Amino acid sequence: LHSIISSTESVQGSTSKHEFQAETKKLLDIVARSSEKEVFIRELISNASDALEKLRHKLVSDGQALPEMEIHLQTNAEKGTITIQDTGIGMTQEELVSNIGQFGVGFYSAFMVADRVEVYSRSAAPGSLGYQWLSDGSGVFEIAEASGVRTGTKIIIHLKSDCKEFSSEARVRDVVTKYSNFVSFPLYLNGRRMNTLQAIWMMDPKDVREWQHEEFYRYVAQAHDKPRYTLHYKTDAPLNIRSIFYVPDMKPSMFDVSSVALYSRKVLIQTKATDILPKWLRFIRGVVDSEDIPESALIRKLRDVLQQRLIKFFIDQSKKDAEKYAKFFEDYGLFMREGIVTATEQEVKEDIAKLLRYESSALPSGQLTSLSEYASRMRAGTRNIYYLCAPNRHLAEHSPYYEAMKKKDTEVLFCFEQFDELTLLHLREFDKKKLISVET
Numbered sequence: 001l002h003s004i005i006s007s008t009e010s011v012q013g014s015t016s017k018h019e020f021q022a023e024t025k026k027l028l029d030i031v032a033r034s035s036e037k038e039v040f041i042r043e044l045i046s047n048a049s050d051a052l053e054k055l056r057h058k059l060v061s062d063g064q065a066l067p068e069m070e071i072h073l074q075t076n077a078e079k080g081t082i083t084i085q086d087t088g089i090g091m092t093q094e095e096l097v098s099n100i101g102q103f104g105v106g107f108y109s110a111f112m113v114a115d116r117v118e119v120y121s122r123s124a125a126p127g128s129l130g131y132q133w134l135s136d137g138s139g140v141f142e143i144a145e146a147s148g149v150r151t152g153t154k155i156i157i158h159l160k161s162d163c164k165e166f167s168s169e170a171r172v173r174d175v176v177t178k179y180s181n182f183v184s185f186p187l188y189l190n191g192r193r194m195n196t197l198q199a200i201w202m203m204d205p206k207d208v209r210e211w212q213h214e215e216f217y218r219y220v221a222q223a224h225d226k227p228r229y230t231l232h233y234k235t236d237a238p239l240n241i242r243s244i245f246y247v248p249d250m251k252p253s254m255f256d257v258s259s260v261a262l263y264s265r266k267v268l269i270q271t272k273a274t275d276i277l278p279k280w281l282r283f284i285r286g287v288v289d290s291e292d293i294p295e296s297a298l299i300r301k302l303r304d305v306l307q308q309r310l311i312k313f314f315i316d317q318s319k320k321d322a323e324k325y326a327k328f329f330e331d332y333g334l335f336m337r338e339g340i341v342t343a344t345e346q347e348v349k350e351d352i353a354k355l356l357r358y359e360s361s362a363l364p365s366g367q368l369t370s371l372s373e374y375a376s377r378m379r380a381g382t383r384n385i386y387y388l389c390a391p392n393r394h395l396a397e398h399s400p401y402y403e404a405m406k407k408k409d410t411e412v413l414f415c416f417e418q419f420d421e422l423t424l425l426h427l428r429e430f431d432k433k434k435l436i437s438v439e440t
């Protein structure tokens with residue numbers, strides 16, 4: 001076992017009393033009078049991770065050797081406490097007094113569960129002194145210089161009467177595994193290394209190998225096949241997004257017809273995000289991580305950005321490997337047709353419709369075309385897109401209506417899927433060209 005938490009600190013003098021500022025008091029009042037208490041742990045772990053990253057980047061910028069960089073949790077049932085300590089960059093006295101800002105999120109989270117909070121911090125800057133910070137959540141906090149403070153930050157939470165469950169090792173273990181499994185620094189609970197995983201969505205896409213995606217896909221999809229498609233989407237405008245999307249190699253089953261995990265800086269928000277993607281993209285598996293995450297205007301914005309990017313991805317795949325894309329459309333194309341029918345906005349219907357592939361009177365049997373490719377072949381004076389739904393190519397070609405049209409070179413899409421009729425009825429037009437069935 002490997003533990004660093006113990007009572008090493010002492011205070012030689014008296015404490016200085018300070019009064020919280022008005023809005024901090026008002027938010028402390030809200031917390032006292034107001035739930036999902038367990039999330040204080042994931043917030044504290046996240047701040048510890050940020051403090052460690054700050055130290056690491058600073059030391060690597062210099063030529064300095066790296067110390068042990070770890071996050072530790074300790075429970076004490078006999079004393080009703082939970083403690084977190086990390087060996088990161090710590091806080092100066094100025095910061096401990098210069099108190100939403102991530103110092104604040106860990107703050108209100110802690111007082112959700114605490115009768116009082118006891119903090120020791122020492123900045124990694126050379127010559128830094130250690131400090132004790134104390135508060136019971138009233139309008140006052142106390143600060144005093146402390147000896148025996150390890151570089152970094154230790155937070156001791158003296159738990160409320162109704163929050164003693166967080167002094168149980170097993171309860172805390174389960175909370176850590178639920179929300180904090182992908183934390184990027186070593187994490188220990190009561191001296192035992194927690195088994196945590198690698199957040200590969202945060203890596204630059206060019207550095208993630210196929211075997212890593214295969215392992216991660218099988219984990220997030222709880223699957224045994226490989227992904228037929230992988231999209232690692234990283235952007236910083238207009239939104240922060242680090243995401244990986246997978247399409248299964250297997251065809252969709254009934255389970256897929258009846259999704260994705262949501263994170264924020266490697267902190268789980270929802271294991272199964274409800275509306276992160278449009279419903280028609282529910283066959284996608286994977287992860288979405290956004291620093292911008294508190295239904296909301298933001299979730300709507302994120303969903304629309306991801307929809308556009310995934311449609312672009314599939315368009316680009318049809319260009320990279322048309323035979324592979326044709327199989328994907330055969331296997332997953334009912335989701336696209338569903339999305340066209342259920343979509344409200346004409347622009348969204350036409351975006352999804354860019355993924356449709358059909359046979360054509362102008363192409364060899366078996367060969368597929370897109371609507372935009374059909375449009376590029378339209379002859380001057382003919383301004384509509386013509387189609388015919390039939391069980392197979394032979395029956396379409398021997399339609400008396402198609403036979404007559406053949407005399408004037410008009411291309412006709414041949415559509416064999418039973419839901420093509422409804423899809424094209426609902427699509428109605430594409431790139432300002434009406435869709436017309438050549439038989440009524």
Ligand SMILES: O=C(c1ccc(O)c(C(=O)n2cc3ccc(F)cc3c2)c1)n1cc2cccc(F)c2c1
Nearest residue numbers: 044047048050051054086088090091106107119153
């Ligand atoms: O959540 C934290 C917290 C937890 C772990 C930490 O390592 C730190 C820290 O020193 N940095 C240093 C950082 C430097 C950069 C950065 F990005 C994050 C950092 C976290 C802060 N709280 C909550 C508090 C509530 C009251 C008093 C406190 F002391 C509190 C500390």
Ligand SMILES: O=C(c1ccc(O)c(C(=O)n2cc3ccc(F)cc3c2)c1)n1cc2cccc(F)c2c1
Nearest residue numbers: 386400401402403404405406410436437438439440
């Ligand atoms: O009057 C007609 C009607 C009559 C003759 C037709 O050839 C068509 C047709 O399919 N065309 C006519 C064409 C003319 C030119 C062409 F290129 C293709 C054509 C296909 C429709 N209908 C058809 C109905 C179906 C359901 C309900 C109704 F009330 C309907 C009334």
